[PDB]
């Protein structure tokens, strides 16, 4: 989301920071991981984990 | 190719139903959504509703839900009837077919798209007058 | 970081232009630039080297003017102490150019006393035509 | 209804009356009186086959652009009602075709 | 009045060469009082070198400066494609602050 910040004067010298408009689409925040890289790292973790169990 | 030709009486007394039908020639109901658009004098076009092969009747909320849109592949033709017609409902009635597109702006597994309808093949329209005179 | 100037101006000959310079576009900021640094005002006409107009002090907004601009330039700080202003009166077609504000310790900061316009801002294009 | 008048051989530029809030998909319709409505532009820029390469829409690239239909070299026949069916991502289902723009060619 | 003269107004070079830019003063500078500035059209001006030899904060090690008296040089060790701009020297130590005319770099 393209966020707009808005300053509100709430007291003498005091500014509250609000969210104003979203500019463009409303979308969800998200994270991406490479699927093959994550699977290979999980295999390495599983192999180091089988030495204890 | 898709041909489509409307049909209707044109002479309807107020406070009853009005039926306009739409016969499609050239092929069957393969690809298409089917929609109805009326145009009254003194104002612009007006989308009134659309259906598809799943028979999901979706109407304009601006037209009171007095409307019934149906179709059949036995006769292979479309049909429209609205209930309790007032004399302000005189208009040219166009039968049209609609393609659905999806506009994708983000992640599709989050549902960040929408569907839109483009009416590509139209018809001439029936000039249906409603009056008791 | 950066300096935020007002928008480009088109003026008549004999009029006045007023340019702003802020270190923060937040109107209710507490940035305290312009109480720590000197702010230079520097124009560049097309086809010329940069020309220095004046500098305003952090100390109580005391201005030093160039002698060729002294009779028609005013350098002001906002009473909120978070913006500085240039006012050039009696405009002529050779006053057209890009105007910059620049920020400088100006030999006044207590460890090393250096001199550098280290943060420049933007540039307001000023056109004088009729 | 919004009238707009353009001389022959010039370029007419019909703006959409509605503004998009978000990514749009804009259909442009041409409606002569007594004739059937004709789809000129769909998906903000795409012409269906059978539409001349004088109609253009503005593509939805780098949000902030207004949707305009551009008619280059307006004929005597290119005068009708023009509808901008505007769909976007923050407005829901677009039941309205919008207000028309009656083009008049001058001469 | 101190006048600064920058000797070649246009200078042509290939990306990866060593370039000398020169500033000549009318008198005797303090050498805490000479700086260099990068001007390109459509971009924010940037301090390159202050105090005749000190690099700025966002300034790479390919730039250095030297000089004394009335002779000052800004040398670029390896020319990059973003170093193709006008470079100005300016002098502190009296008002009006004066700039130096400018040496523009274009590629071969
Ligand atoms: C984490 O990972 C996830 C992965 O899950 C990432 O998620 C991705 O997030 C991005 C957003 O950041 C999404 O991007 C949007 O994608 C859509 C969908 O694109 C697909 O569909 C397009 C249309 O398909 C049409 O044609 C095909 C036949 O080709 C047909 O099958 C279909 O039915 C339909 O008819 C394809 O064009 C597109 O192809 C892309 O990839 C091809 C191969 O990779 C490549 O060859 C292509 O060149 C193209 O790049 C793909 O299959 C895009 O439509 C959308 O882009 C439009 O929207 C944005 C925002 O509105 C706009 O700014 C863009 O400029 C672009 O707008 C153009 O298209 C509109 C519709 O087409 C049109 O209305 C506009 O006017 C504008 O049109 C201009 O360009 C087009 C061509 O570009 C031209 O024809 C016009 O005339 C005009 O010039 C977004 O990019 C991803 O969908 C999403 N991925 C998934 C899997 O969900 C996430 O980002 C990651 N996060 C992080 C932090 O990393
Ligand atoms: C008040 O403000 C004024 C105005 O700035 C100050 O006056 C200047 O002070 C600076 C102090 O750094 C002076 O610079 C020094 O100059 C001396 C003497 O220069 C002569 O001797 C040199 C031999 O060493 C010779 O090379 C010089 O020739 C160059 O300069 C002339 C111009 O003067 C030029 O025409 C030539 O072509 C040459 O380019 C010149 O004949 C010099 O000895 C100093 O060098 C030392 O320091 C530098 C850097 O620190 C170092 O690199 C050297 O190796 C050497 O160790 C230094 O350059 C400047 O000359 C003064 N200018 C004027 C106009 O007066 C004044 O000092 C201020 N007062 C106070 C109290 O602050
Ligand atoms: C998030 O939304 C922002 C809107 O609030 C987007 O900012 C816009 O970005 C474009 C280009 O990225 C800018 O277009 C430029 O405009 C200037 C002239 O504008 C000047 O004047 C306005 C007010 O008059 C001022 O607000 C600007 O800051 C400028 O000082 C041209 O010179 C450029 O060539 C270019 O056309 C928009 O001006 C800008 N709008 C605002 C309000 O800042 C931002 O791009 C969005 N971000 C993302 C990632 O989508
Ligand atoms: C806190 O409150 C203060 C008091 O209301 C605010 O200060 C005033 O803000 C207004 C609007 O920004 C300024 O008016 C502007 O003046 C400039 C030019 O200044 C000349 O004219 C004014 C009268 O307008 C005169 O008083 C001066 O001496 C100058 O001769 C114009 O270009 C503008 O169009 C606008 O009219 C006031 O000048 C300003 N100061 C005072 C003392 O009233 C202050 O902005 C508030 N702070 C915050 C952070 O919001
Ligand atoms: C995370 O973002 C980085 C960019 O910071 C992506 O890395 C780039 O990937 C493309 C295509 O694979 C390469 O051409 C670039 O050279 C990569 N590096 C940079 C700096 O752009 C990476 O693909 C992203 N990862 C995920 C999982 O989305
Ligand atoms: C991860 O790798 C293992 C072995 O390499 C494989 O059995 C498994 O299917 C992989 N999982 C995914 C999600 O790729």
TrEMBL record, chain A:
Post-translational modification: Highly glycosylated by host. The high number of glycan on the protein is reffered to as 'glycan shield' because it contributes to hide protein sequence from adaptive immune system.
Glycosylation-annotated residues: 2, 39
Origin superkingdom: Viruses
Subcellular location: Host cell membrane; Host endosome membrane; Virion membrane
Family: Belongs to the HIV-1 env protein family.
General function of this protein: Envelope glycoprotein gp160: Oligomerizes in the host endoplasmic reticulum into predominantly trimers. In a second time, gp160 transits in the host Golgi, where glycosylation is completed. The precursor is then proteolytically cleaved in the trans-Golgi and thereby activated by cellular furin or furin-like proteases to produce gp120 and gp41.
Complex formation: The mature envelope protein (Env) consists of a homotrimer of non-covalently associated gp120-gp41 heterodimers. The resulting complex protrudes from the virus surface as a spike. There seems to be as few as 10 spikes on the average virion. Surface protein gp120 interacts with host CD4, CCR5 and CXCR4. Gp120 also interacts with the C-type lectins CD209/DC-SIGN and CLEC4M/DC-SIGNR (collectively referred to as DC-SIGN(R)). Gp120 and gp41 interact with GalCer.
Free-text note on domains in this protein's UniProt record: The CD4-binding region is targeted by the antibody b12. The 17 amino acids long immunosuppressive region is present in many retroviral envelope proteins. Synthetic peptides derived from this relatively conserved sequence inhibit immune function in vitro and in vivo.
Further comment: HIV-1 lineages are divided in three main groups, M (for Major), O (for Outlier), and N (for New, or Non-M, Non-O). The vast majority of strains found worldwide belong to the group M. Group O seems to be endemic to and largely confined to Cameroon and neighboring countries in West Central Africa, where these viruses represent a small minority of HIV-1 strains. The group N is represented by a limited number of isolates from Cameroonian persons. The group M is further subdivided in 9 clades or subtypes (A to D, F to H, J and K).
Protein name as catalogued: Envelope glycoprotein gp160
Residues of the full protein shown: 299 to 351 of 860
